[PDB]
């Protein structure tokens, strides 16, 4: 499943979109 | 941060929820 594997880039971004939905995120790279 | 712990390391439904408002 999807949370377990390697995110980057734009695909952590959606990963968060879809995980967190009406909550929303914040997406820091640092 | 995000990056360090679900893209150079393998991610997780708590590394993602952890950043949810």
């Known amino acids: ?30 | 941060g995000i990056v360090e712990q679900c893209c150079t390391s393998i991610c997780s439904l708590y590394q993602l929820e952890n950043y949810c408002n």
Do not use: D, I, W
């Open chain 1, 1 to 30: 499943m999807f949370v377990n594997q390697h995110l980057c880039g734009s695909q952590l971004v959606e990963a968060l979109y879809l995980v967190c939905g009406e909550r929303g995120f914040f997406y820091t790279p640092k």
